[PDB]
Design a protein around this ligand. Structure first.
Ligand SMILES: [Ca+2]
Ligand SMILES: [Ca+2]
Ligand SMILES: [Cl-]
Ligand SMILES: [Cl-]
Lengths: 487, 486
């Protein structure tokens, strides 16, 4: 079928055909022609044409549309959740929560727009000071596979509210989800050209990123890809880049009474979404000694009972297959590399079937690795690091160029204050999973995890620029003139 | 001893340089610059001081910056005098630059609380907490046009947030920077929190290439800022704030009060001898009788503008430009444009080849087929004659820059059309283009910035948000996610 959405219509792409496969069954989910360079040109040209009339609308007219989109997401939740499940492996129970996050994004983004990029007037001596915020123009949005609905929506909704038009390039691993999402935008009444969908693989991505008529590029993906993008835009400060990248996130465990609650939060942190959330814990730092040993044993016990199954299994699994058979193979390979370097498995990762994305929830003790690779997380291979005192835990925690999330499990509030003041990261929790977050707070990694353009609540900030005016309805001479002015 | 490192004045190891009053050519400041090793020591000192400074109570940091503001007001005449001597700026105007430096403080405190404050709110599983953290050591590169106010616009908010600073001033305004740093010292800034590396190109390169700075906050030309941007490509982890120049249009439309329009045009084009970042480079004036009368009145008044030494009695409207070389460069730019078919209305001359004095000049560029899109640096105002408001708007927007713009027009409808279409960060109606509220964001679009607006929004690049969910009581949830077995 027609798979590109350009200028208000589904059109056929000119580029090579590709497919997505359900990592749990290997059944094809989506298959279609990609967007060639010319298709991308048409998509951008369409966004550019539509921008004048979209940005010229009243704010409330744009808001009415995004709110309609939210209401349709709720109505069509099960179907969209099912597509996310089928295509990416994410369990149906979790997929539903992603859709709920997509809908909830709208009202939060309207509130953020008014808070961060609103409109204000104040008297001043020679007029009225007026602050407005204006959209940049055409923005490219690059989507990921881990939250193929929620994370692109976190760029798209604030971008649209502000009055930008959009060219959306979804991950090649979640084109079906993107199609289903664009369908709902269309039914919500979004005008022709305001959102354009270019499905594709690396060539489609490269063509969009290299286009000279885009005003911004909002990216969610790996630090390696994000960094290359950043390099590619060096010397073009006029393009706004928002790069939301990955991490090497630490979870520090210290003395707690409720050891099972700590284990629970560590399990959520390491293995929710099969370890594929940007904020998942890659390193779990646990003290040497008797308490630390009890924690590891209890963590291994519960983790060994983690069920990994097809997305619509009954009973529902905690996690699904990772995004692909290829990713599962890379994780196993990553474990073998670390074992090469002296790591010792607690729960060894195995890929159940080379054709599928199933790998078990795994725990690798990396304490004896001399120079621990500082590498981005992409699956449920938890690294245990044994430490001495809290100061040692903190130094280890911070031993990374990344800085997305971090957490502390501890009853001692004083350990929290020490930890939180020393740790360098954008999302930092106490006695919660590292993947816990307020939907109404900013979300931005430090170091290589970002480019100081936090998203979520602060997405507004990169979706519009301030335009400050002094307005004087009456033109008037000043009563007294600067020296040297003779009228 | 002209470098300020770890709370003391120390000798630089780099080559000696000097600043000169562009009005008389008399030397104003002279001293040894900071070598690569000197810059290393300054950064190390800022790094040493960071932990105790960031850990200090916000109220204690604010006390010190408010004392700085109070001392600026106390010592206004001396600091204004140094700005005037060194850069040519008339004393009357230099006084106002010091006033803006002082006003920056209370506004930056308010901005910190509003944009980078602290919030707490209930959540199902604990308390959502929003804090903001400083980056660490930040390099600040100063310009010559506002050699006190524009660096202060980075330094004040950076310090409030808890960053430490290494300040590299324009080599054309080292004395102003020394005088400012002496006031910071008297304000009680702790040792190492602010460090001063005076110098020329090599000093600036060593600081910008330092791998242990966390941010670089720059005010200067688009050419230099863009080269810095390129230098950081591939290093997204470093916060760059680039406040660059413009090719700012002022559109004139039908007004009854032609003299007021001319006044605002004069202020826009010639205040600070055209060297404000927000000064009008192009004045767009309609064809026809009204526009002809405006141009005639503009030329009549502009012809009587006086440029003189900073301390002249009577005071001049404007001074020399920053250097004899910059003066020479403006007259050459005029000749280039005349070669492309421009015609002088008031021709620019350089008074004396050893001095920075040029007159307030007006050049008709309407006949230039391909008008160069270049960043402004002096009092050479370009007249462009247009047809209707849509044509003025198209021409106004015909630039890769986007710092300021203005409309002079009685009709509110013309304003509505104008402001909805113009692409710029500072856009005024019936005011000079260098009109600004001190309490508003200040950031240019296109090549005029990198979407890190300063002034009120400087707070945003001086601290990063850290968002937390805190549950002081650790607990299992109500019901477990599926597939969890305890
Ligand atoms: Ca680091
Ligand atoms: Ca432009
Ligand atoms: Cl803190
Ligand atoms: Cl507007």
């Amino acid at each position: 079928m027609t798979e590109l959405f350009i200028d208000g219509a589904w059109v056929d792409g000119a580029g090579p055909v590709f497919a997505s496969r359900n990592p749990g069954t290997n059944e094809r989910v989506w298959e279609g022609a990609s967007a060639s360079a010319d298709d991308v040109e048409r998509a951008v040209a369409s966004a550019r044409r539509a921008f004048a009339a979209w940005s010229a609308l009243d704010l409330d007219a744009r808001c009415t549309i995004v709110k309609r989109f939210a209401a349709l997401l709720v109505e069509r939740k099960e179907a969209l959740a099912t597509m996310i499940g089928r295509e990416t492996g994410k369990p149906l129970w979790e997929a539903r929560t992603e859709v709920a996050s997509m809908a909830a994004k709208v009202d939060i983004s309207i509130t953020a727009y008014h808070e961060r990029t609103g409109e204000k007037r104040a008297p001043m001596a020679d007029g009225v000071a007026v602050l407005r915020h204006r959209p940049h123009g055409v923005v490219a949005v690059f989507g990921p596979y881990n939250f193929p609905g929620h994370l692109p929506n976190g760029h798209i909704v604030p971008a649209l509210i502000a009055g930008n038009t959009v060219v959306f390039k979804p991950s090649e691993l979640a084109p079906g989800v993107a199609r289903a999402t664009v369908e709902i935008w269309r039914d919500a009444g979004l005008p022709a050209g305001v959102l354009n969908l270019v499905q594709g693989e690396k060539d489609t991505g490269v063509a969009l990123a290299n286009h000279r008529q885009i005003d911004g590029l909002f990216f969610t993906g790996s630090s390696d890809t994000g960094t290359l993008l950043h390099k590619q835009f060096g010397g073009r400060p006029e393009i706004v880049l928002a790069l939301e990248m990955g991490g090497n996130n630490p979870l520090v465990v210290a003395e707690v009474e409720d050891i099972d609650a700590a284990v629970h939060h560590a399990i959520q942190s390491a293995f929710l979404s099969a370890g594929q959330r940007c904020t998942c814990a890659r390193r779990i730092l646990v003290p040497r000694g008797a308490f630390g040993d009890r924690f590891v044993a209890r963590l291994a016990d519960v983790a060994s009972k983690i069920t990994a199954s097809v997305f619509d299994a009954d009973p529902q699994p905690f996690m699904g297959a990772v995004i692909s058979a290829r990713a599962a193979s890379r994780l196993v390979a990553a474990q073998a590399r670390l074992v090469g370097l002296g790591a010792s498995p607690i729960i060894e990762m195995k890929q159940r079937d080379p054709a599928l994305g199933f790998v078990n929830a795994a725990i690798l003790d990396v304490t004896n690795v001399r120079e621990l690779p500082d590498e981005e997380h992409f699956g449920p291979l938890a690294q245990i690091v044994r430490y001495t005192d809290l100061d040692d835990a903190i130094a280890r925690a911070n031993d990374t160029a990344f800085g997305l999330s971090a957490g502390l499990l501890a009853d001692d509030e004083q350990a929290w204050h020490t930890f939180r003041r020393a740790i360098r990261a954008g999302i930092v929790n106490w006695n919660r999973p590292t993947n816990g977050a307020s939907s109404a707070a900013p979300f931005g990694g430090a170091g290589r995890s970002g480019n100081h353009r936090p998203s979520a609540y602060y997405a507004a900030d990169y979706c519009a620029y301030p335009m400050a005016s002094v307005e004087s309805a009456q033109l008037q001479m000043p009563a007294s003139l600067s020296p040297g002015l003779h009228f």
